[PDB]
Design a protein around this nucleic acid. Structure first.
Length: 99
DNA sequence: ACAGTTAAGAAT
DNA sequence: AATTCTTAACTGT
């Protein structure tokens, strides 16, 4: 069991670490979006604390924390991180080396 | 180094 | 249970 509580104010949703492809910032202030296989969950959190949960969670961009276990491939020239579910996000110039 | 954008603290 | 203001730290080139 590697469970994370995604706190939502009137409720919480619980997911496994490896259900999560990546996290990004929401356009709602102080919310993030957890990208699961084919669902997304909005919750209260910050990307910094998620990257500190576990070494699989890597801060590849100011707006993205990726789950290394669910990365399918990486285009290092375009700085695109592709996930097993066929979503993608971006790594910043300063962080792309380290993924 | 630069001009523009944004994550997350403080308050409530 | 959510929202704004704020500003240091980030962004790509």
């Amino acid at each position: 069991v590697e469970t994370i509580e995604l706190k939502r104010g009137s409720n919480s949703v619980y997911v496994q670490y490896d259900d999560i492809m990546f996290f990004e910032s929401s356009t709602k202030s102080h919310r993030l979006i957890a990208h699961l296989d084919n669902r997304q969950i909005e919750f209260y959190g910050n990307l910094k604390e998620l990257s500190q949960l576990d070494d699989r969670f890597f801060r590849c961009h100011n707006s993205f924390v990726v789950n290394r276990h669910n990365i399918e491939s990486i285009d290092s020239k375009e700085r695109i991180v592709y996930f097993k579910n066929k979503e993608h996000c971006y790594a910043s110039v300063r962080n792309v080396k380290k993924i």
